[PDB]
Amino acid sequence: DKKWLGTPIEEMRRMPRLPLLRPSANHTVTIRVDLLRAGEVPKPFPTHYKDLWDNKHVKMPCSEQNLYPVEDTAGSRWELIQTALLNKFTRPQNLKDAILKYNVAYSKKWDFTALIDFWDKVLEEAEAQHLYQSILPDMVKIALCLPNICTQPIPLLAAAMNHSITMSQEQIASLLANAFFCTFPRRNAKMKSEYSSYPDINFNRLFEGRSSRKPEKLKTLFCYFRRVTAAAPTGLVTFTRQSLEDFPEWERCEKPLTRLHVTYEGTIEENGQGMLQVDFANRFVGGGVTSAGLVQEEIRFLINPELIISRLFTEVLDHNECLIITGTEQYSEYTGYAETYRWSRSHEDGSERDDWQRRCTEIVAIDALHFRRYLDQFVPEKMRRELNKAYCGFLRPGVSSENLSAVATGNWGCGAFGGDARLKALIQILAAAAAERDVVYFTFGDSELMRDIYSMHIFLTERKLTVGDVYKLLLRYYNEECRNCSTPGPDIKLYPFIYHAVESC
Numbered sequence: 001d002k003k004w005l006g007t008p009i010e011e012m013r014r015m016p017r018l019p020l021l022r023p024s025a026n027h028t029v030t031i032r033v034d035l036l037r038a039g040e041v042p043k044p045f046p047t048h049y050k051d052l053w054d055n056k057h058v059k060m061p062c063s064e065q066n067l068y069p070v071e072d073t074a075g076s077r078w079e080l081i082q083t084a085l086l087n088k089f090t091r092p093q094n095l096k097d098a099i100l101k102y103n104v105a106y107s108k109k110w111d112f113t114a115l116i117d118f119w120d121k122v123l124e125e126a127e128a129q130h131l132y133q134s135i136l137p138d139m140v141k142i143a144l145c146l147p148n149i150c151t152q153p154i155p156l157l158a159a160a161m162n163h164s165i166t167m168s169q170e171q172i173a174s175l176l177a178n179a180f181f182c183t184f185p186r187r188n189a190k191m192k193s194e195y196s197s198y199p200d201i202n203f204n205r206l207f208e209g210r211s212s213r214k215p216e217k218l219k220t221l222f223c224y225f226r227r228v229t230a231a232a233p234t235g236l237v238t239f240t241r242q243s244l245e246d247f248p249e250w251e252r253c254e255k256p257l258t259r260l261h262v263t264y265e266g267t268i269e270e271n272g273q274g275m276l277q278v279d280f281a282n283r284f285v286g287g288g289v290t291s292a293g294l295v296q297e298e299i300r301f302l303i304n305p306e307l308i309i310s311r312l313f314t315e316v317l318d319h320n321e322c323l324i325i326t327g328t329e330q331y332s333e334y335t336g337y338a339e340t341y342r343w344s345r346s347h348e349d350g351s352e353r354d355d356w357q358r359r360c361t362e363i364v365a366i367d368a369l370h371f372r373r374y375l376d377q378f379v380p381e382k383m384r385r386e387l388n389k390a391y392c393g394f395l396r397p398g399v400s401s402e403n404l405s406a407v408a409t410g411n412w413g414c415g416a417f418g419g420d421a422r423l424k425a426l427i428q429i430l431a432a433a434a435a436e437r438d439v440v441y442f443t444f445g446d447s448e449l450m451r452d453i454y455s456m457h458i459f460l461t462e463r464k465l466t467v468g469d470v471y472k473l474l475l476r477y478y479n480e481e482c483r484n485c486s487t488p489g490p491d492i493k494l495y496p497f498i499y500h501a502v503e504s505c
Protein backbone atom coordinates (compact mmCIF):
# COMPACT_ATOMS: atom_id res chain seq x y z
CA ASP A 1 0.00 0.00 0.00
CA LYS A 2 3.08 2.29 -0.88
CA LYS A 3 2.40 5.93 0.24
CA TRP A 4 4.64 7.48 -2.52
CA LEU A 5 5.96 6.53 -6.00
CA GLY A 6 8.93 7.22 -8.30
CA THR A 7 12.28 8.81 -7.44
CA PRO A 8 12.97 9.04 -3.69
CA ILE A 9 12.32 12.56 -2.32
CA GLU A 10 15.90 12.46 -0.84
CA GLU A 11 17.35 12.23 -4.40
CA MET A 12 15.28 15.26 -5.55
CA ARG A 13 17.33 18.49 -5.91
CA ARG A 14 16.82 20.54 -2.71
CA MET A 15 18.38 24.08 -2.14
CA PRO A 16 20.55 26.32 -1.43
CA ARG A 17 26.51 30.78 -4.67
CA LEU A 18 25.00 34.33 -5.09
CA PRO A 19 26.26 37.37 -7.16
CA LEU A 20 26.79 40.60 -5.16
CA LEU A 21 23.35 42.17 -4.35
CA ARG A 22 23.31 45.68 -5.85
CA PRO A 23 20.59 47.98 -7.27
CA SER A 24 20.25 48.08 -11.05
CA ALA A 25 17.99 49.34 -13.87
CA ASN A 26 15.76 46.23 -13.33
CA HIS A 27 16.39 45.70 -9.55
CA THR A 28 15.26 47.75 -6.52
CA VAL A 29 17.28 47.30 -3.22
CA THR A 30 15.76 49.45 -0.37
CA ILE A 31 18.42 48.58 2.31
CA ARG A 32 22.14 49.23 2.94
CA VAL A 33 24.01 46.34 1.33
CA ASP A 34 27.43 47.41 2.71
CA LEU A 35 25.95 47.03 6.26
CA LEU A 36 23.86 43.87 5.52
CA ARG A 37 24.97 41.37 8.18
CA ALA A 38 23.62 38.07 9.68
CA GLY A 39 21.60 38.56 12.88
CA GLU A 40 21.73 42.37 12.36
CA VAL A 41 18.46 44.26 11.48
CA PRO A 42 19.03 45.91 7.97
CA LYS A 43 19.57 49.69 7.79
CA PRO A 44 17.21 51.33 5.24
CA PHE A 45 18.69 53.09 2.12
CA PRO A 46 18.36 56.17 1.84
CA THR A 47 18.78 57.60 5.38
CA HIS A 48 16.07 60.31 5.03
CA TYR A 49 12.64 59.59 3.56
CA LYS A 50 12.40 60.10 -0.24
CA ASP A 51 8.94 60.64 -1.73
CA LEU A 52 7.38 59.74 -5.11
CA TRP A 53 3.67 60.26 -5.98
CA ASP A 54 3.35 59.05 -9.63
CA ASN A 55 1.57 56.49 -11.93
CA LYS A 56 4.83 54.37 -11.61
CA HIS A 57 5.18 54.01 -7.79
CA VAL A 58 3.33 53.10 -4.55
CA LYS A 59 1.39 56.09 -3.09
CA MET A 60 2.71 56.04 0.53
CA PRO A 61 0.33 57.04 3.41
CA CYS A 62 3.14 59.28 4.79
CA SER A 63 3.57 61.35 1.52
CA GLU A 64 3.24 65.18 1.67
CA GLN A 65 0.89 64.75 -1.38
CA ASN A 66 -1.44 62.58 0.73
CA LEU A 67 -4.14 65.21 1.58
CA TYR A 68 -7.92 65.33 2.34
CA PRO A 69 -10.55 68.17 1.84
CA VAL A 70 -11.29 70.46 4.88
CA GLU A 71 -13.91 73.24 5.67
CA ASP A 72 -12.42 76.58 4.42
CA THR A 73 -7.93 74.22 3.08
CA ALA A 74 -6.37 70.75 2.46
CA GLY A 75 -5.18 68.92 5.58
CA SER A 76 -2.49 66.21 5.74
CA ARG A 77 -3.90 62.64 5.83
CA TRP A 78 -0.74 61.28 7.63
CA GLU A 79 -1.28 63.72 10.51
CA LEU A 80 -4.95 62.53 10.64
CA ILE A 81 -3.69 58.82 10.75
CA GLN A 82 -1.29 59.59 13.66
CA THR A 83 -3.90 61.61 15.63
CA ALA A 84 -6.42 58.80 14.94
CA LEU A 85 -4.19 55.78 15.92
CA LEU A 86 -2.54 57.27 19.02
CA ASN A 87 -5.67 56.72 21.23
CA LYS A 88 -6.23 53.77 23.59
CA PHE A 89 -8.51 51.15 21.96
CA THR A 90 -10.16 49.21 24.85
CA ARG A 91 -13.31 48.06 22.95
CA PRO A 92 -13.61 47.02 19.21
CA GLN A 93 -15.57 50.20 18.37
CA ASN A 94 -12.48 52.29 19.35
CA LEU A 95 -10.48 50.67 16.49
CA LYS A 96 -13.42 50.93 13.97
CA ASP A 97 -13.74 54.67 14.81
CA ALA A 98 -9.94 55.13 14.42
CA ILE A 99 -9.80 53.43 10.94
CA LEU A 100 -12.92 55.46 9.82
CA LYS A 101 -11.40 58.84 10.92
CA TYR A 102 -9.12 58.86 7.84
CA ASN A 103 -11.56 56.76 5.76
CA VAL A 104 -14.71 58.96 5.84
CA ALA A 105 -16.28 57.98 2.49
CA TYR A 106 -16.47 54.28 3.71
CA SER A 107 -17.88 54.85 7.24
CA LYS A 108 -21.20 53.35 5.99
CA LYS A 109 -19.81 50.84 3.39
CA TRP A 110 -17.25 49.12 5.68
CA ASP A 111 -18.55 46.50 8.05
CA PHE A 112 -16.55 45.69 11.24
CA THR A 113 -18.69 42.66 12.45
CA ALA A 114 -15.95 40.03 12.25
CA LEU A 115 -13.54 42.36 14.12
CA ILE A 116 -16.20 42.99 16.85
CA ASP A 117 -17.17 39.23 17.04
CA PHE A 118 -13.50 38.10 17.31
CA TRP A 119 -12.71 40.61 20.13
CA ASP A 120 -16.05 40.30 22.01
CA LYS A 121 -17.22 36.73 21.18
CA VAL A 122 -14.20 34.55 20.13
CA LEU A 123 -11.26 35.93 22.29
CA GLU A 124 -11.13 35.24 26.07
CA GLU A 125 -10.91 38.30 28.43
CA ALA A 126 -7.14 37.92 29.04
CA GLU A 127 -6.58 37.24 25.29
CA ALA A 128 -8.55 40.37 24.30
CA GLN A 129 -6.68 42.13 27.14
CA HIS A 130 -3.37 41.27 25.41
CA LEU A 131 -4.83 42.60 22.12
CA TYR A 132 -5.87 46.17 23.11
CA GLN A 133 -2.98 46.55 25.57
CA SER A 134 0.06 44.96 23.87
CA ILE A 135 -0.32 43.83 20.17
CA LEU A 136 -2.39 46.84 18.84
CA PRO A 137 -0.27 49.62 20.48
CA ASP A 138 2.88 47.84 19.12
CA MET A 139 1.18 47.54 15.67
CA VAL A 140 0.37 51.31 15.59
CA LYS A 141 4.03 52.02 16.62
CA ILE A 142 5.55 50.06 13.62
CA ALA A 143 2.87 51.54 11.22
CA LEU A 144 3.61 55.14 12.30
CA CYS A 145 7.36 54.53 12.00
CA LEU A 146 6.91 53.99 8.16
CA PRO A 147 8.86 57.17 7.01
CA ASN A 148 11.95 55.86 8.94
CA ILE A 149 11.56 52.24 7.75
CA CYS A 150 10.53 52.69 4.05
CA THR A 151 12.76 55.61 2.96
CA GLN A 152 13.05 54.67 -0.75
CA PRO A 153 10.13 54.91 -3.25
CA ILE A 154 8.87 51.36 -4.09
CA PRO A 155 8.11 50.84 -7.86
CA LEU A 156 4.95 49.07 -9.04
CA LEU A 157 5.76 45.68 -10.67
CA ALA A 158 3.54 46.62 -13.66
CA ALA A 159 2.47 44.20 -16.44
CA ALA A 160 5.22 43.46 -19.03
CA MET A 161 8.06 44.50 -16.59
CA ASN A 162 10.87 42.04 -15.71
CA HIS A 163 11.78 43.69 -12.40
CA SER A 164 12.71 42.61 -8.81
CA ILE A 165 12.28 44.46 -5.42
CA THR A 166 14.63 43.28 -2.60
CA MET A 167 13.47 44.72 0.79
CA SER A 168 13.87 43.78 4.50
CA GLN A 169 11.24 41.77 6.45
CA GLU A 170 11.15 44.78 8.92
CA GLN A 171 10.11 47.05 6.00
CA ILE A 172 7.40 44.51 5.04
CA ALA A 173 5.96 44.52 8.68
CA SER A 174 5.74 48.34 8.85
CA LEU A 175 3.99 48.17 5.42
CA LEU A 176 1.56 45.36 6.50
CA ALA A 177 0.69 47.20 9.82
CA ASN A 178 -0.40 50.09 7.53
CA ALA A 179 -2.57 47.72 5.43
CA PHE A 180 -4.20 46.38 8.68
CA PHE A 181 -4.98 49.96 9.65
CA CYS A 182 -6.24 50.62 6.06
CA THR A 183 -3.82 53.54 5.49
CA PHE A 184 -2.87 53.07 1.81
CA PRO A 185 -4.43 55.89 -0.24
CA ARG A 186 -6.13 55.42 -3.64
CA ARG A 187 -6.71 51.61 -3.15
CA ASN A 188 -10.31 51.69 -1.74
CA ALA A 189 -13.03 52.66 -4.24
CA LYS A 190 -14.33 49.94 -6.57
CA MET A 191 -14.92 52.54 -9.37
CA LYS A 192 -11.39 54.04 -9.81
CA SER A 193 -9.14 53.12 -12.79
CA GLU A 194 -5.81 53.87 -11.07
CA TYR A 195 -5.55 50.50 -9.26
CA SER A 196 -8.42 48.44 -10.80
CA SER A 197 -5.78 46.11 -12.38
CA TYR A 198 -4.22 45.70 -8.85
CA PRO A 199 -5.46 43.49 -5.93
CA ASP A 200 -6.91 44.93 -2.65
CA ILE A 201 -4.19 45.79 -0.11
CA ASN A 202 -5.98 47.46 2.86
CA PHE A 203 -7.36 44.78 5.30
CA ASN A 204 -10.87 46.31 5.55
CA ARG A 205 -12.65 43.27 4.03
CA LEU A 206 -11.22 40.97 6.75
CA PHE A 207 -13.42 42.78 9.29
CA GLU A 208 -16.80 42.16 7.57
CA GLY A 209 -19.59 39.62 8.07
CA ARG A 210 -20.03 36.59 10.36
CA SER A 211 -17.91 33.87 8.67
CA SER A 212 -16.58 31.37 11.27
CA ARG A 213 -13.28 31.46 9.25
CA LYS A 214 -12.36 35.21 9.73
CA PRO A 215 -11.51 34.75 13.52
CA GLU A 216 -9.11 32.02 12.38
CA LYS A 217 -7.57 34.33 9.66
CA LEU A 218 -7.30 37.09 12.34
CA LYS A 219 -5.65 34.69 14.90
CA THR A 220 -3.12 33.81 12.09
CA LEU A 221 -2.38 37.47 11.27
CA PHE A 222 -2.18 38.60 14.91
CA CYS A 223 0.29 35.73 15.59
CA TYR A 224 2.48 37.33 12.81
CA PHE A 225 2.05 40.93 14.08
CA ARG A 226 2.80 39.77 17.63
CA ARG A 227 6.13 38.06 16.44
CA VAL A 228 7.57 40.91 14.26
CA THR A 229 6.59 43.65 16.80
CA ALA A 230 8.19 41.66 19.72
CA ALA A 231 11.46 40.94 17.84
CA ALA A 232 12.49 42.83 14.67
CA PRO A 233 12.99 40.40 11.74
CA THR A 234 16.62 40.43 10.46
CA GLY A 235 16.29 38.96 6.97
CA LEU A 236 15.40 40.07 3.40
CA VAL A 237 12.72 39.15 0.75
CA THR A 238 12.93 39.34 -3.14
CA PHE A 239 9.83 39.85 -5.34
CA THR A 240 10.52 39.14 -9.09
CA ARG A 241 7.99 39.70 -11.93
CA GLN A 242 8.91 37.38 -14.81
CA SER A 243 7.39 38.05 -18.22
CA LEU A 244 8.27 35.82 -21.23
CA GLU A 245 8.39 37.04 -24.85
CA ASP A 246 9.46 33.78 -26.60
CA PHE A 247 7.62 30.50 -25.72
CA PRO A 248 8.49 26.94 -26.93
CA GLU A 249 6.98 25.38 -30.10
CA TRP A 250 5.41 22.59 -27.96
CA GLU A 251 4.61 20.30 -30.95
CA ARG A 252 8.31 20.27 -31.98
CA CYS A 253 10.02 20.10 -28.47
CA GLU A 254 12.77 17.40 -28.51
CA LYS A 255 13.36 17.40 -24.68
CA PRO A 256 12.68 14.17 -22.69
CA LEU A 257 10.74 13.91 -19.37
CA THR A 258 12.54 14.63 -16.05
CA ARG A 259 12.24 12.61 -12.75
CA LEU A 260 9.06 12.33 -10.68
CA HIS A 261 8.14 11.80 -7.02
CA VAL A 262 4.37 11.42 -6.56
CA THR A 263 2.61 11.08 -3.17
CA TYR A 264 -0.88 11.28 -1.55
CA GLU A 265 0.71 12.42 1.76
CA GLY A 266 2.65 15.53 2.78
CA THR A 267 2.39 19.25 1.92
CA ILE A 268 4.19 21.80 -0.30
CA GLU A 269 5.52 23.88 2.68
CA GLU A 270 6.75 20.87 4.78
CA ASN A 271 7.97 18.26 2.30
CA GLY A 272 8.88 20.71 -0.46
CA GLN A 273 11.61 22.42 1.64
CA GLY A 274 14.43 23.78 -0.56
CA MET A 275 12.31 23.27 -3.75
CA LEU A 276 10.40 25.62 -6.06
CA GLN A 277 7.07 25.66 -4.29
CA VAL A 278 4.08 26.30 -6.52
CA ASP A 279 1.30 28.66 -5.41
CA PHE A 280 -2.05 27.76 -7.03
CA ALA A 281 -2.53 31.51 -7.73
CA ASN A 282 -5.31 33.92 -8.72
CA ARG A 283 -4.54 36.50 -11.56
CA PHE A 284 -4.76 39.07 -8.72
CA VAL A 285 -2.01 37.56 -6.46
CA GLY A 286 -3.16 36.35 -3.05
CA GLY A 287 -6.80 35.91 -4.18
CA GLY A 288 -9.20 36.72 -1.34
CA VAL A 289 -6.57 36.70 1.48
CA THR A 290 -7.80 40.04 2.90
CA SER A 291 -11.50 38.92 2.57
CA ALA A 292 -13.57 35.69 2.33
CA GLY A 293 -11.26 33.35 0.30
CA LEU A 294 -9.55 30.56 2.33
CA VAL A 295 -7.92 27.93 0.07
CA GLN A 296 -4.35 26.89 -1.07
CA GLU A 297 -3.22 30.47 -1.90
CA GLU A 298 -4.97 32.25 1.03
CA ILE A 299 -3.75 29.63 3.58
CA ARG A 300 -0.12 30.20 2.41
CA PHE A 301 -0.55 33.97 2.38
CA LEU A 302 -1.86 33.63 6.04
CA ILE A 303 0.92 31.23 7.26
CA ASN A 304 3.60 33.23 5.33
CA PRO A 305 2.35 36.92 5.71
CA GLU A 306 5.23 38.62 3.74
CA LEU A 307 3.42 37.19 0.68
CA ILE A 308 0.47 39.62 1.32
CA ILE A 309 2.74 42.61 0.50
CA SER A 310 3.10 41.49 -3.20
CA ARG A 311 -0.53 42.85 -3.48
CA LEU A 312 0.75 46.42 -2.92
CA PHE A 313 2.92 46.46 -6.18
CA THR A 314 2.02 43.39 -8.34
CA GLU A 315 -0.27 44.31 -11.30
CA VAL A 316 -2.78 41.63 -12.36
CA LEU A 317 -0.88 38.66 -13.94
CA ASP A 318 -1.25 38.39 -17.75
CA HIS A 319 -0.91 34.84 -19.35
CA ASN A 320 2.86 35.23 -19.99
CA GLU A 321 3.71 36.38 -16.46
CA CYS A 322 4.35 34.86 -12.99
CA LEU A 323 5.52 36.30 -9.62
CA ILE A 324 8.63 34.80 -7.93
CA ILE A 325 8.80 35.53 -4.06
CA THR A 326 12.10 34.41 -2.35
CA GLY A 327 12.83 34.66 1.36
CA THR A 328 9.41 34.52 3.04
CA GLU A 329 9.17 33.13 6.63
CA GLN A 330 6.47 30.84 8.08
CA TYR A 331 5.08 32.26 11.36
CA SER A 332 2.12 29.86 11.87
CA GLU A 333 1.18 26.17 11.99
CA TYR A 334 -2.35 25.28 10.85
CA THR A 335 -5.00 22.54 10.67
CA GLY A 336 -7.77 21.86 8.14
CA TYR A 337 -8.57 23.61 4.82
CA ALA A 338 -11.25 25.99 3.41
CA GLU A 339 -14.35 25.89 5.75
CA THR A 340 -12.39 23.82 8.38
CA TYR A 341 -9.17 25.96 8.47
CA ARG A 342 -7.91 26.42 12.02
CA TRP A 343 -4.85 28.29 13.39
CA SER A 344 -2.82 25.60 15.35
CA ARG A 345 0.23 27.26 17.03
CA SER A 346 3.20 29.64 16.47
CA HIS A 347 5.83 28.14 14.17
CA GLU A 348 9.55 28.86 14.39
CA ASP A 349 10.88 28.67 10.79
CA GLY A 350 14.24 26.87 10.99
CA SER A 351 15.22 27.53 7.36
CA GLU A 352 18.73 28.79 6.59
CA ARG A 353 19.40 32.19 5.00
CA ASP A 354 21.33 32.75 1.78
CA ASP A 355 24.18 35.31 1.02
CA TRP A 356 21.34 37.96 0.72
CA GLN A 357 20.03 37.01 4.20
CA ARG A 358 16.85 35.65 2.46
CA ARG A 359 15.27 32.46 3.95
CA CYS A 360 16.13 29.54 1.55
CA THR A 361 12.34 29.41 0.54
CA GLU A 362 11.26 30.05 -3.11
CA ILE A 363 7.52 30.37 -4.09
CA VAL A 364 6.10 30.90 -7.67
CA ALA A 365 2.62 32.40 -8.23
CA ILE A 366 1.14 30.82 -11.32
CA ASP A 367 -2.55 31.46 -12.12
CA ALA A 368 -4.56 28.68 -13.74
CA LEU A 369 -7.65 29.09 -15.97
CA HIS A 370 -11.27 29.19 -14.88
CA PHE A 371 -13.11 26.75 -17.11
CA ARG A 372 -16.67 27.93 -17.92
CA ARG A 373 -17.43 24.37 -19.26
CA TYR A 374 -15.27 21.29 -18.43
CA LEU A 375 -14.45 20.41 -22.13
CA ASP A 376 -12.83 23.87 -22.79
CA GLN A 377 -9.55 22.78 -21.05
CA PHE A 378 -8.65 20.38 -23.93
CA VAL A 379 -8.98 23.26 -26.53
CA PRO A 380 -5.41 23.70 -28.03
CA GLU A 381 -4.99 27.48 -27.19
CA LYS A 382 -6.09 26.66 -23.59
CA MET A 383 -3.57 23.71 -23.16
CA ARG A 384 -0.86 25.86 -24.83
CA ARG A 385 -1.78 28.67 -22.32
CA GLU A 386 -1.39 26.47 -19.19
CA LEU A 387 1.86 25.03 -20.62
CA ASN A 388 3.18 28.60 -21.16
CA LYS A 389 1.96 29.60 -17.69
CA ALA A 390 3.76 26.75 -15.91
CA TYR A 391 6.89 27.06 -18.21
CA CYS A 392 7.23 30.75 -17.20
CA GLY A 393 7.05 29.98 -13.47
CA PHE A 394 9.52 27.07 -13.87
CA LEU A 395 11.98 28.70 -16.31
CA ARG A 396 15.05 30.51 -14.91
CA PRO A 397 16.65 32.45 -17.80
CA GLY A 398 20.42 32.17 -17.43
CA VAL A 399 20.55 29.29 -14.91
CA SER A 400 22.23 25.87 -15.49
CA SER A 401 20.07 22.68 -15.32
CA GLU A 402 22.11 21.16 -12.41
CA ASN A 403 21.70 24.28 -10.23
CA LEU A 404 17.84 24.14 -10.43
CA SER A 405 15.88 22.48 -7.57
CA ALA A 406 12.80 20.26 -8.19
CA VAL A 407 9.31 21.74 -8.57
CA ALA A 408 7.07 21.02 -5.57
CA THR A 409 3.52 21.02 -7.07
CA GLY A 410 -0.01 19.50 -6.86
CA ASN A 411 -3.58 19.83 -8.25
CA TRP A 412 -3.19 23.35 -9.73
CA GLY A 413 -6.46 25.03 -10.78
CA CYS A 414 -8.77 22.20 -9.60
CA GLY A 415 -11.84 22.98 -7.48
CA ALA A 416 -14.26 25.74 -8.53
CA PHE A 417 -11.89 26.17 -11.59
CA GLY A 418 -12.86 22.73 -13.01
CA GLY A 419 -9.40 21.52 -14.07
CA ASP A 420 -8.83 17.84 -14.94
CA ALA A 421 -6.27 16.63 -12.42
CA ARG A 422 -4.81 14.08 -14.92
CA LEU A 423 -4.45 16.71 -17.71
CA LYS A 424 -2.99 19.42 -15.36
CA ALA A 425 -0.52 16.81 -14.03
CA LEU A 426 0.69 16.17 -17.63
CA ILE A 427 0.89 19.94 -18.46
CA GLN A 428 3.06 20.52 -15.28
CA ILE A 429 5.24 17.45 -16.08
CA LEU A 430 5.72 18.80 -19.72
CA ALA A 431 6.44 22.38 -18.42
CA ALA A 432 9.05 21.17 -15.94
CA ALA A 433 10.69 18.97 -18.59
CA ALA A 434 11.00 21.97 -21.02
CA ALA A 435 12.59 23.99 -18.18
CA GLU A 436 14.93 21.05 -17.10
CA ARG A 437 13.48 20.53 -13.56
CA ASP A 438 12.33 17.31 -11.78
CA VAL A 439 8.71 17.16 -10.36
CA VAL A 440 7.59 16.51 -6.73
CA TYR A 441 3.76 16.03 -6.94
CA PHE A 442 1.35 16.03 -3.95
CA THR A 443 -2.09 14.48 -4.71
CA PHE A 444 -3.71 15.49 -1.35
CA GLY A 445 -5.22 12.24 0.00
CA ASP A 446 -6.02 10.90 -3.52
CA SER A 447 -4.32 7.48 -3.63
CA GLU A 448 -5.78 6.66 -7.10
CA LEU A 449 -4.52 9.91 -8.76
CA MET A 450 -0.95 9.21 -7.50
CA ARG A 451 -0.92 5.66 -9.03
CA ASP A 452 -2.37 7.18 -12.29
CA ILE A 453 0.22 9.98 -12.53
CA TYR A 454 3.09 7.57 -11.70
CA SER A 455 1.93 5.01 -14.33
CA MET A 456 1.58 7.62 -17.07
CA HIS A 457 5.00 9.13 -16.32
CA ILE A 458 6.65 5.65 -16.28
CA PHE A 459 4.84 4.65 -19.55
CA LEU A 460 6.03 7.83 -21.39
CA THR A 461 9.63 7.54 -19.92
CA GLU A 462 10.14 3.86 -20.94
CA ARG A 463 8.72 4.21 -24.48
CA LYS A 464 11.04 7.39 -24.65
CA LEU A 465 8.55 10.13 -25.83
CA THR A 466 9.59 13.84 -26.07
CA VAL A 467 7.64 16.95 -24.87
CA GLY A 468 6.63 17.30 -28.56
CA ASP A 469 5.61 13.60 -28.74
CA VAL A 470 3.32 14.01 -25.64
CA TYR A 471 1.91 17.46 -26.66
CA LYS A 472 0.86 15.89 -30.04
CA LEU A 473 -1.16 13.27 -28.06
CA LEU A 474 -3.13 16.06 -26.29
CA LEU A 475 -3.91 17.63 -29.72
CA ARG A 476 -5.13 14.20 -30.89
CA TYR A 477 -7.41 13.87 -27.83
CA TYR A 478 -9.16 17.23 -28.59
CA ASN A 479 -9.63 16.25 -32.30
CA GLU A 480 -10.76 12.64 -31.69
CA GLU A 481 -12.67 13.11 -28.36
CA CYS A 482 -13.64 16.91 -27.98
CA ARG A 483 -13.84 18.92 -31.35
CA ASN A 484 -17.38 17.64 -32.22
CA CYS A 485 -18.17 16.04 -28.76
CA SER A 486 -21.59 17.58 -27.80
CA THR A 487 -22.05 15.58 -24.52
CA PRO A 488 -20.62 17.19 -21.27
CA GLY A 489 -18.39 14.10 -20.76
CA PRO A 490 -16.36 12.45 -23.59
CA ASP A 491 -16.87 8.69 -24.34
CA ILE A 492 -13.15 7.89 -23.65
CA LYS A 493 -10.81 9.47 -20.99
CA LEU A 494 -7.27 11.05 -21.53
CA TYR A 495 -4.82 8.51 -20.00
CA PRO A 496 -6.67 5.46 -21.63
CA PHE A 497 -6.41 7.39 -24.96
CA ILE A 498 -2.66 7.96 -24.39
CA TYR A 499 -1.96 4.25 -23.65
CA HIS A 500 -4.13 3.34 -26.73
CA ALA A 501 -2.52 5.82 -29.23
CA VAL A 502 1.04 4.70 -28.28
CA GLU A 503 0.46 0.87 -27.88
CA SER A 504 -1.41 0.72 -31.26
CA CYS A 505 1.61 2.55 -32.91
Ligand SMILES: Cn1c(=O)c2cc(S(O)(O)NC3(C)CC3)ccc2n(Cc2ccccc2)c1=O
Binds near residue numbers: 444
Ligand atom coordinates in the same frame (compact mmCIF):
# COMPACT_ATOMS: atom_id res chain seq x y z
C1 LIG B 1 -7.38 20.76 -2.48
N1 LIG B 1 -6.45 20.77 -1.35
C2 LIG B 1 -5.19 21.32 -1.56
O1 LIG B 1 -4.89 21.77 -2.65
C3 LIG B 1 -4.28 21.31 -0.41
C4 LIG B 1 -3.00 21.86 -0.53
C5 LIG B 1 -2.12 21.82 0.54
S1 LIG B 1 -0.50 22.48 0.36
O2 LIG B 1 -0.44 23.20 -0.88
O3 LIG B 1 0.44 21.43 0.60
N2 LIG B 1 -0.28 23.58 1.53
C6 LIG B 1 -0.88 24.94 1.63
C7 LIG B 1 -2.40 24.96 1.71
C8 LIG B 1 -0.14 26.02 0.91
C9 LIG B 1 -0.09 25.94 2.41
C10 LIG B 1 -2.52 21.30 1.76
C11 LIG B 1 -3.80 20.78 1.90
C12 LIG B 1 -4.69 20.76 0.82
N3 LIG B 1 -6.01 20.22 0.92
C13 LIG B 1 -6.52 19.70 2.23
C14 LIG B 1 -6.41 18.20 2.38
C15 LIG B 1 -5.17 17.58 2.53
C16 LIG B 1 -5.08 16.21 2.68
C17 LIG B 1 -6.22 15.44 2.73
C18 LIG B 1 -7.46 16.04 2.62
C19 LIG B 1 -7.55 17.42 2.46
C20 LIG B 1 -6.90 20.23 -0.14
O4 LIG B 1 -8.02 19.76 -0.04
